[PDB]
Design a protein around this ligand. Sequence first.
Ligand code: SF4
Ligand code: SF4
Ligand code: SF4
Ligand code: SF4
Ligand code: FES
Ligand SMILES: [Zn+2]
Lengths: 48, 230, 95, 114, 126, 208, 176, 105
Amino acid sequence: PTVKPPTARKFIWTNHKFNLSGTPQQYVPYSTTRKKIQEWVPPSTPYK
Amino acid sequence: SNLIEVFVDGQSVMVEPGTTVLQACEKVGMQIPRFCYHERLSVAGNCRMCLVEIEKAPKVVAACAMPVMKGWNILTNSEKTKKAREGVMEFLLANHPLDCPICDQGGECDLQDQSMMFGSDRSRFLEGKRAVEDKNIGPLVKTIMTRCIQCTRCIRFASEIAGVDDLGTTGRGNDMQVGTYIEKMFMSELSGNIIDICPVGALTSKPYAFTARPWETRKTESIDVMDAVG
Amino acid sequence: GVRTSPTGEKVTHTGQVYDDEDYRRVRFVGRQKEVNENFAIDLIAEQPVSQVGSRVISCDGGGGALGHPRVYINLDKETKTGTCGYCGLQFRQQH
Amino acid sequence: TSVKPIFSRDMNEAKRRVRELYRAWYREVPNTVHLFQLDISVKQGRDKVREMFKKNAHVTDPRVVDLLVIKGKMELEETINVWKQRTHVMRFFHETEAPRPKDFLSKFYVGHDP
Amino acid sequence: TQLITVDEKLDITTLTGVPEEHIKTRKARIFVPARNNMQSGVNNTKKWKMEFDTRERWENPLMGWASTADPLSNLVLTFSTKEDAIAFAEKNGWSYDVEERKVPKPKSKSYGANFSWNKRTRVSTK
Amino acid sequence: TRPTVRPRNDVAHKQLSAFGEYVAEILPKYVQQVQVSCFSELEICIHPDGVIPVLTFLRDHSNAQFKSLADLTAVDIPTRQNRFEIVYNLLSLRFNSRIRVKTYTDELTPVESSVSVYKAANWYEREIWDMFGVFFANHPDLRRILTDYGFEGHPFRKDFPLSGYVELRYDDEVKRVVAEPVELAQEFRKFDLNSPWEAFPAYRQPPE
Amino acid sequence: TYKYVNLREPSMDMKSVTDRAAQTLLWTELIRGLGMTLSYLFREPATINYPFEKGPLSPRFRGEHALRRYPSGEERCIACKLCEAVCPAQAITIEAEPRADGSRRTTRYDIDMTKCIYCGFCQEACPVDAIVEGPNFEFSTETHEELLYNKEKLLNNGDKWEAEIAANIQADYLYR
Amino acid sequence: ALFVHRDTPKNNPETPFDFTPENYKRIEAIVKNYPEGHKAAAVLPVLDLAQRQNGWLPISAMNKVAEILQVPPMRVYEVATFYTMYNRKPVGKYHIQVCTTTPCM
Ligand code: SF4
Ligand code: SF4
Ligand code: SF4
Ligand code: SF4
Ligand code: FES
Ligand SMILES: [Zn+2]
């Protein structure tokens, strides 16, 4: 692999981080989605 | 008296005078593949996929609007019927760009279904494929006029039932743009009905545009609200 | 171009960042919220705009049967640039 | 209308079969409740067996009644065997509530459950 | 050979193993499905589809899915006539709501009256 | 029409057609339909009373042996007053052909326990009993194969949904694995694919 | 076309019958089996030094389920839902929205690594080859929840390498 | 080519446009040849008169024709784009047309 080690792109980790699982620092998932239906805001000024 | 006999593939059936071949075929069940006919719109023989062979006729009749004379016999599955359908499907698929993923009528196209069930599979005319830039129709419709197959369904419906009288054909040949020439903001009543009557993905919904796809969603009963017509 | 939420953790390019009351904040206690450091919004802002003097021009994305297929875009408008739905990189004209 | 039945000529043979089967279920309780090493009293299980028999009381056609006799016969076969373990015998019992009664109001709080 | 038979309804509903909660709670709906009006295909007709009523599908709090407690929300049954639907629903017991089949209307169209002389039908552009 | 199209022959077609007509002639008592497939596998649609006479006739009779018993399942079809279909497949040992006996039945009225003529019928029979619910006349053993012992409902039916009504999990409270009602995390998105436009017009049933 | 065996007689001559008697009573061919086992004992075995050597594979091996992106470009996917349309466990879940820039996007791209039967159908169905069957097979996750990849998870997965993936594609774009 | 209007004043009404009352009498002869019921059939001769009065037609010429002939304006746009006489774009006073296709080339 000394013939073509890199590629000429700007996105690549220079680190080559190892198998990051089994650590205190690893992946946990979550739903990547915004607010569903924008629950209703009560009125600001108090009445009576 | 009031009954005209046609032989769809030999089978006799009674047809009222003044009606098309297509209503007879739907009476016996045959869906003739069609693009520019609509069962609630005025008829104009444009799409040419409605061809069928009646025997002892060298030409091929456009059965979208062919009236029914006395005592017919119709070959729905003749060889030149299949040849004509493969040919018209071969003509339509050149100047329609490779947009079926990014289109919004993936499960709800018409070229795709009739090209499967009627057309060829190995294309020709290896280069070409004109590109026509759209207009700014309005906030309600997202508009890509490049996929417009110029089927002239929006224009007929617009000018007759909508009566807005602004969808115009400009030019000739490959250069025939559909729409208002001077980029008027198309704002009128019933202007949202057009996004589904357009049979290809030339027109689509502006909020729905890149959200989902009809094979995921399930279909459910409801009745119209806010209007007492229902 | 990652930002910082008022809670403290990093935002995402999809606008799903947390409130002051979400408990997925408290399930992210102790471990990394693995966010991306590559935002494709500003990489298109890094991309120059080509100037091709022809009328109807092609796009492939660098490779025969590699990347996205042949899409032919139009340049007949004077001021509205030709944007590929697959590439997202615009074009100009030299007439 | 001519339909072949399973076994019987009226409901009398069906009642005969089902009460002989229930007698077999009643005599079949103590050996298996000592063998399976259970923790539920004999009265409770016997009342649940007779309550399960009384659950299907609204059936009058003798074909279906003989079919349920065949069902309970297969059940009593698999329980006179030691094939079934503690799991299915406790699965007849319903200890995993699910507490929702037929109140309208308890159905109002835990919504969408009419 | 022309044996015992008594004529009633059928009692498969105690045999099918579904509890009485989902017997009396959920209700079936029997109809001919809609023509997908963007396309023009009446091939999706001629099929009396039996469906149920949908119920709650809450969000999966970790993944964002349609977390539903509904085993019977994903069934559809294809029938030939309405009589088969009625016999099937009364066979397996739970309640049914049958809608009426609404066919299209054979409507008269003619190119000459489209392009006539003194009528108001004039497309003025084609 | 010549290249890359699956070759068929008229020879096996005419042989099986004449043989099926011959069988229908020599047994006029239970034959209803003798359909010859275009790919030359015979199907014979049959009334459910002389099933054991049919099987004793088809094990033997020296013009076609058919000593091989095979697939049988009463394939779940709704909409019919006679729902289930008992299809006994028979394969010869001397003549190399495949015939299917599709006799019809409904749910409650029993078929007549084909184990008396074929030794390999028993586990197939017990399978169909536990899975569909097809009862038998003078049958040795009806037990449950391929299912749980506490499970019920004949789950292959169109009555039965994708999921069950049971869900096993262990608890330490009552110290066992109990069955609870279903708690699905995923929708099972049923992707509807029934597209229009009638790809096979030759198989169209005549409408009203 | 049949070639059946064991139909040959033992010879009733004294020669072969006492040779079989010598085989029976004298333990000859069992010692010949011992000699066969010793002949394979004096080999050198076909093992591997596992943390140091990694065995042979294919350029078409289907592992990581990683993403790609364009040369100095945007995210490669379209949200055209073909992979979700063909995934045999419905392990794909794509909730999609467009951003305001016009280029069509997503919200949430979801692969159940629990539910993946590792076909290659989502590779062969993607028109731009956004989701790529990966080259390496090292997941070995301690927890259950971490087997549920998200979009930015797969983007950071693709940010560690592409040159391996591009080499496999460059060797494998011509056979398919 | 270039069938977007791309307004760019010298267009974008109001652009001042007019005829002659003598030309109005010409237009009365024009809709005097055609029978009643089809007053819109004179779109082609009236827009021919518009090209005779102005060497290239602007948008306000079409707007004035849409005022006069009780027509929807889009049909006027269609006929203006459709045929070959009506150079909607400015040309010289004289215009040079070199006819050459099959015998001529
Ligand atoms: S309308 Fe055009 S781009 Fe859209 S699905 Fe049909 S053929 Fe494909
Ligand atoms: S915009 Fe649509 S409906 Fe109108 S002509 Fe084009 S393809 Fe037909
Ligand atoms: S097939 Fe490819 S482009 Fe389409 S949704 Fe899946 S990953 Fe995206
Ligand atoms: S390889 Fe995995 S993610 Fe891809 S289609 Fe198959 S099961 Fe689905
Ligand atoms: S329907 Fe399109 S031409 Fe007859
Ligand atoms: Zn591109």
